[PDB]
Write a protein that binds this ligand. Sequence first.
Ligand SMILES: O=C(N[C@@H](Cc1ccccc1)C(=O)N1CC(C(=O)O)C1)c1cc2cc(Cl)ccc2[nH]1
Ligand SMILES: O=C(N[C@@H](Cc1ccccc1)C(=O)N1CC(C(=O)O)C1)c1cc2cc(Cl)ccc2[nH]1
Ligand SMILES: O=C(N[C@@H](Cc1ccccc1)C(=O)N1CC(C(=O)O)C1)c1cc2cc(Cl)ccc2[nH]1
Ligand SMILES: *Cc1c(COP(=O)(O)O)cnc(C)c1O
Ligand SMILES: *Cc1c(COP(=O)(O)O)cnc(C)c1O
Ligand SMILES: CC(=O)N[C@@H]1O[C@H](CO)[C@@H](O)[C@H](O)[C@H]1O
Ligand SMILES: CC(=O)N[C@@H]1O[C@H](CO)[C@@H](O)[C@H](O)[C@H]1O
Ligand SMILES: Cn1c(=O)c2c(ncn2C)n(C)c1=O
Ligand SMILES: Cn1c(=O)c2c(ncn2C)n(C)c1=O
Ligand SMILES: Cn1c(=O)c2c(ncn2C)n(C)c1=O
Ligand SMILES: Cn1c(=O)c2c(ncn2C)n(C)c1=O
Lengths: 77, 793, 69, 793
Amino acid sequence: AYGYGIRYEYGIFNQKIRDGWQVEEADDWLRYGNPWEKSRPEFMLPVHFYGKVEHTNTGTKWIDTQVVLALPYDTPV
Amino acid sequence: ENVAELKKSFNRHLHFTLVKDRNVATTRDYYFALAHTVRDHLVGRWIRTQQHYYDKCPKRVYYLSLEFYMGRTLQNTMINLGLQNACDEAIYQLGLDIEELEEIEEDAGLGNGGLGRLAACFLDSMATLGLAAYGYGIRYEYGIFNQKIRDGWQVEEADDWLRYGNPWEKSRPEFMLPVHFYGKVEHTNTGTKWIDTQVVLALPYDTPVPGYMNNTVNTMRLWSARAPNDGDYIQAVLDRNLAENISRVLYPNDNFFEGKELRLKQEYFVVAATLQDIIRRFKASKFTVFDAFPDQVAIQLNDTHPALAIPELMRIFVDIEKLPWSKAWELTQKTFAYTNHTVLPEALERWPVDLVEKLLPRHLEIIYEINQKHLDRIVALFPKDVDRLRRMSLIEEEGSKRINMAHLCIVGSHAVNGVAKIHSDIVKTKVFKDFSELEPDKFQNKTNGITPRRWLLLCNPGLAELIAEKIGEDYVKDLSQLTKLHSFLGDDVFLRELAKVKQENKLKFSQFLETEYKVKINPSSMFDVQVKRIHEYKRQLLNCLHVITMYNRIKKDPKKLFVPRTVIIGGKAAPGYHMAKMIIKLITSVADVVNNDPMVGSKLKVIFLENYRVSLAEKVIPATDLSEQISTAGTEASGTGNMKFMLNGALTIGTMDGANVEMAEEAGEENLFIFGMRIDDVAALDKKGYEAKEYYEALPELKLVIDQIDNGFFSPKQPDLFKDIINMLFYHDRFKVFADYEAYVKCQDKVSQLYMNPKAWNTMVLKNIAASGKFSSDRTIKEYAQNIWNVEP
Amino acid sequence: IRRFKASKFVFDAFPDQVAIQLNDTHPALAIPELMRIFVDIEKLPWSKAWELTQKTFAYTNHTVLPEAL
Amino acid sequence: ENVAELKKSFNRHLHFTLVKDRNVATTRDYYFALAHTVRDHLVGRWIRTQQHYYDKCPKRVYYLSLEFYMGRTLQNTMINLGLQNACDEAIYQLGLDIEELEEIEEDAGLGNGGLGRLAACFLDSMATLGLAAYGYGIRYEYGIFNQKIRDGWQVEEADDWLRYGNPWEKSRPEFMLPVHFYGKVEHTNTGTKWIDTQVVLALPYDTPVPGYMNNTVNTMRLWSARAPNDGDYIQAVLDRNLAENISRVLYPNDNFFEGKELRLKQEYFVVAATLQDIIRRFKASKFTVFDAFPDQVAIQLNDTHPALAIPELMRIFVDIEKLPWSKAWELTQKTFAYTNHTVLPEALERWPVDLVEKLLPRHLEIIYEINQKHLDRIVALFPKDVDRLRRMSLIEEEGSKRINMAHLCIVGSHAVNGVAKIHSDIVKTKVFKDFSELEPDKFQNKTNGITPRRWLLLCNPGLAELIAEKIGEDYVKDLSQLTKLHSFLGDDVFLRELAKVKQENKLKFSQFLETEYKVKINPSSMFDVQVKRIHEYKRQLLNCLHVITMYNRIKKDPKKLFVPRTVIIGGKAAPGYHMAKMIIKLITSVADVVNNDPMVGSKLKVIFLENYRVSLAEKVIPATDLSEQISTAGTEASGTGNMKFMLNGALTIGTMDGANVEMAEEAGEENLFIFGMRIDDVAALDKKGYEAKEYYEALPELKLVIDQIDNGFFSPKQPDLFKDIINMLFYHDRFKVFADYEAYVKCQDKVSQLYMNPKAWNTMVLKNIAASGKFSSDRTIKEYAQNIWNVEP
Ligand SMILES: O=C(N[C@@H](Cc1ccccc1)C(=O)N1CC(C(=O)O)C1)c1cc2cc(Cl)ccc2[nH]1
Ligand SMILES: O=C(N[C@@H](Cc1ccccc1)C(=O)N1CC(C(=O)O)C1)c1cc2cc(Cl)ccc2[nH]1
Ligand SMILES: O=C(N[C@@H](Cc1ccccc1)C(=O)N1CC(C(=O)O)C1)c1cc2cc(Cl)ccc2[nH]1
Ligand SMILES: *Cc1c(COP(=O)(O)O)cnc(C)c1O
Ligand SMILES: *Cc1c(COP(=O)(O)O)cnc(C)c1O
Ligand SMILES: CC(=O)N[C@@H]1O[C@H](CO)[C@@H](O)[C@H](O)[C@H]1O
Ligand SMILES: CC(=O)N[C@@H]1O[C@H](CO)[C@@H](O)[C@H](O)[C@H]1O
Ligand SMILES: Cn1c(=O)c2c(ncn2C)n(C)c1=O
Ligand SMILES: Cn1c(=O)c2c(ncn2C)n(C)c1=O
Ligand SMILES: Cn1c(=O)c2c(ncn2C)n(C)c1=O
Ligand SMILES: Cn1c(=O)c2c(ncn2C)n(C)c1=O
């Protein structure tokens, strides 16, 4: 088995009670470092967003896209 | 188009076209049903394409050649039409294996090697670029012979490729034409008349040439010889074979001139038919009327083989269309362009005027007049220099008069090109100096190329997919896009994936080798490959020396670390080429000793790849680690196999000759294993004098090899079997094998070193593949379109 | 997909080597994305790819609350 | 320590730290495993060193700078720890190439050029001398951008140097600190209070600085910006980027002031954190308590960038530690020392008081008070001279009020120094005349230096070994020992060995050039190099004129003996520096015409060295024959690249400017190719009036070059592409390029003459290297230690 998700810099917020109301504080869980994760840079990948669809004889092409990279981090289970 | 409908069409053809059902259908039957199913997808665009050319009348390009080394058509057609994946699925769903059906198809081997394969790659490129191009050749009943090895020797078998029928060809009876021979000339008051001739009919067969994913389908028109219809009755009917013998068989000579009357008939046959077909088409279009001819028609001469086209066109314009000489000649020079494909003396076409007088009387007269107008000019511009007249004449006088067809092509053409920088240079400043000095702008270079469809997409889908997943499919039509590959030089994973692709190709090709040959293949060894026509200039002999060399080093120190190799050498030898046949026997003799010696084991295997042809090149090329391109510097006009291996992930070891020089420039010299003498070194060694007995005396490793070959170590039953080889090496070797021996071996040692460093080896592989873009035949044709034919996509 | 190709692999065996559980609808786009890869990248016909897809994916519904759909 | 144990440690890290084995390990993985293996050797001495400083409390030196151009750390660390040879052997025994692993390491390019590299050389020197020194900067997520050339133009790419992680840095979370911004001031009865501020946290990262073979390891502490922890929730979390943008990227400007609010934030950010960290440390040691502060702490201001430190310290002493102004001010002046690094008007920092009022309200008030006490004094000593008050004020009134940070540094410091005799002189008697007249003993000179470890031992091992075999290894710590080299001026063999070293460096660097660029390199040609940030004052343009000059002479008389050269010009241009970018395009345009003209051939090659950085300087510098140091006299404060080339065997051609003047003094003027106007000539030409159209009218060779550049000879597709360059040269050239053209070219001709006399050339080379001792940064720091910081090794 393999789990697949997103490595959020900020997880679910830390909740505090101020004057009886809930107050949210950023959960900066990686500030001091996480020894349990292992970057795997050789497996980085590009992800596309936006752009448009071109219908050519070589089939449909998704062009003019903005690219973002995906850097995986493995945690042992 | 979709899977379900492809299954129905297949079953429909198996039934109505093959008259079979699943219980009685043969493998050939399934293949024909699939072939017809795919073939139907071309018809619409083929009619549409040809109709478009008629309505818009773009300038037409005619590639005239005696050779078209087409290989197989089914897979190629499925890829260019975007049907492969669908057909693969449909066939699989019908319970069949498409790969097995594909092996049924006979190769259309109407060529000898490069020259014929270049023409085939050009058609693909011209169709992919959307040009109104037409290829014109001869529909040989028999192509290049099928090669077999019996008792270590090459044995030839007729290549009866049409026996079972050809679904990819379409007879065009309405365009049949008569071609004349012999007869005599009559200079009357109504024009010159070529009469009392022997007539042979030419029946054209059209084969569709589909471009890659563009809806364009051009035509390859091949002519067939047929007896006219107008002593013993039986013999007379049988004698009809004589005429039909004209398009019977392809002359099996690569880079060698054989002045056989039948060949001269094939040259004129294809030429007379083609030029009459182009003229008819011209006059049938929207068009003194001929002034626009050179603006509507461009004819490329593939080597001097179709040289007769120059006078044939003149004959037509003057005797048929009644145009004055001066005008006829002008249009001719604007119409023709000549490609010189070789510099080897033995390959030069020099026809005895006696032979030409008897067979083509009217053409001899025209060639003589062309030479007169030609020499009158020279005499004017150089009143003194009479030796220049002799060197530029279309006629050679020394002994029996002969015609220099190359000279004839130069004067009747407006463009002349070599097939690689170093070759074109040698052609312009050395071989045809006297001509280029007068007409400098006439000579050019058009470096050869190979189509990335058949030679990448078709032969190595794994590599095409890997590349495509990283930089898109853009590269198929614009190969210079492979340079983006440099972005991943430090990407360890992409390098492991690149290697996996090669290894899979090697594992598969290995299954082919253990199936066709006894030998056990070390799948981890290095695949050292040299496949091309057997020639002394290509030096399969040099390679053979290195193999025996490696063998001895192994026997000498069995415990000495040796990088394993599987040396593969293949190629057909011209039937009458004695030295080529002997070289084949030597290789087969070596393999026998090598592959069966317990001490060498899996360290070294040698294979003489039988029946090397296009379909076989598609299998071994993707599986190669090391490509041997070792002809003597200045002897290989260009080479194309070298490009094939470069595009498919192999490293190259060769001399600075042909296109090898340009490969080094594109990828960087350090990323190739260059060695040996260069154009200048060979010349120096010549002026001085090549004494082969010196290297033998100064190199012990070479001496051991030579002694083994000379004393019978590789032919115990026949101690002097290789005498002729030894004799040529020591006294008649124009290709200086012994002179590059030392550099070659040292180069080979470095290759072995690098092979042991996968990271380094594949890194270089990636730079080569990244630098192969330049060699796509689309780029070659692009330069032809712009600088010679003046046509646009 | 890269792992599948690097193992002892064309894609006919994909569903027999790969099972992808979609935790609620959040990763729903994985379905059309695989179709995209199969068809636009791997050049497989639609019918074949749709078949490989359904065999590969499994969906787990984690709620019926209208505001969570 | 020994080979076997280094192999085990390497394998131990590959396994436990990289979670890899040999079959799946990447090149980056091996590099990290080696890096960690070497890194372990520093820990013991790093803890020991810092513990020693705490127990003995020696005076501490803090080098405060916005820049640290560190380059790579692995090799440097192996050399200073005496591990290189052992690691090289271990790695080789593991089947790897240490050189390939080293190339994986990203440069820590947190600098723009000299100013940042000087700081880096200083840390090395301070650690080698055993000083209790600390460097303080900003840990930029992105350093100086990575440069690429696309279509002849410089293109910028983010230098994401931390992406894969940095083994040489150590987060120190327990020392995190808050830095405030904005807010307002409150003058209460319990002290002044700076409130309602925006807080940003600064997280320090420590990097060890190992001295050469001495067991000392100091620290380089770089600060990182982090958002505090105490509308739409998502946006709020995302908005945390704003604060963190403070230490996001290094401003890519060399010698140019950009008054951007973000930059002002970086200046204060690094300053507030540093001063609070030093104060805390001070109060945490063995210590009214602050009276001993200046005896325990010395802070050097690298240029005016960290000028805010003066008021920040005042703010701390008065508002936090509750010290009276008079005392606070005294301690401050005893603590700070200021180094002026430039005299170029455009590089001067002048912040609009409006910007400072909003961002640093409490600091504006303190700067105003400092100016009041400052001007009250002047008014006293010069009751009449009111214009003197305007010229010495910390505030400039002309138009929008601005703050002269340099003035602020002078009054708050007890020492001010230039970076070279001629520069310091100009700083003391001209630019700051009004200040030095009152406080003469305040101004000094501290000629720049470069570390012989990285810039000799690391970059040119062959030369270090040759030198070491002749005079011992003593010179590494005392470079003035190179003078013993004079003992071998007539030693023909030592001269042939000196030349071999250079040639090897040239052959290796040549492989780098043919690998990165198409061009074919003449390994025997003269390596003419000018690598530095692109500037009009540095005159890469002048060099370019000479190249075009040489090119024309070659075209003019192809058969005229020409001493072959490989001209290399490289350097990054500030992104918004238009003229610098245009200059790059010109050079690339020239190379294209030059490198591809058949008539010039191997006589001349031109290369625009892409992405010039520390690791690249280490490759090209050892490979240089001729070093171009040709900035206009009086414009280069000092220069350090010039020193690098001198120590590595290159001859210099330049003007009497910066440290070039001192190089001539040490080696003897005749042993350098000096030319052009001098500080006095340029002034005369100014008073008179520089009319560039005169030299163009009086020098045909220059006119030809100019016409070619202006008429499109180097940009056919864009005839007026270089219009802006021509326009500046003829009407807006403050660096008088045309004025030194003639002298420069004549100087260049003499260099060519000498190059043809190997004995003479290398003899001069030896005198230069022998005279380079003075330029070791150990000597520079020694003078800083004795005359400004008052600390001992
Ligand atoms: O960063 C080092 N160790 C690591 C150890 C670590 C790793 C993973 C989680 C927690 C701690 C470290 O302290 N951190 C990584 C975290 C971050 O990125 O902020 C904090 C380190 C050890 C070392 C030893 C020498 Cl000699 C020089 C530099 C060094 N850095
Ligand atoms: O020739 C027929 N189909 C063709 C189908 C075909 C066409 C072109 C190439 C290969 C196969 C056929 O079998 N061949 C042509 C080849 C040749 O030239 O010898 C072999 C055919 C189908 C059919 C069906 C009926 Cl009911 C009667 C006669 C028929 N002939
Ligand atoms: O992060 C580990 N090693 C570290 C090792 C390292 C440390 C510092 C610089 C480079 C490499 C790692 O791979 N990186 C830190 C870099 C980053 O900040 O992204 C990349 C690690 C080892 C390990 C071993 C197990 Cl069993 C589980 C989790 C693990 N993480
Ligand atoms: C490509 C090819 C050739 C040309 O090979 P060279 O090595 O260039 O002589 C010859 N024969 C076949 C079958 C080919 O596919
Ligand atoms: C040394 C160095 C410099 C300083 O060069 P000058 O010629 O003194 O301006 C600039 N950049 C780099 C990368 C250096 O190594
Ligand atoms: C006469 C002849 O077959 N020439 C061949 O032509 C091909 C195609 O141009 C070249 O690649 C090759 O080197 C050359 O030997
Ligand atoms: C502002 C700035 O970057 N100044 C630079 O400082 C270095 C180090 O002192 C000098 O060598 C150089 O000539 C000068 O241009
Ligand atoms: C290439 N070649 C041939 O193909 C050949 C030949 N002699 C006969 N043939 C067929 N010779 C000498 C030759 O060099
Ligand atoms: C088949 N074959 C040849 O083709 C051959 C030969 N000797 C020379 N040649 C060319 N021998 C002995 C032979 O058996
Ligand atoms: C050095 N330099 C720059 O770095 C610069 C500039 N203009 C913008 N920039 C970034 N100018 C005029 C300049 O001289
Ligand atoms: C990339 N680039 C520039 O950077 C540039 C320019 N013209 C001026 N500059 C600065 N052009 C035309 C250009 O392509």
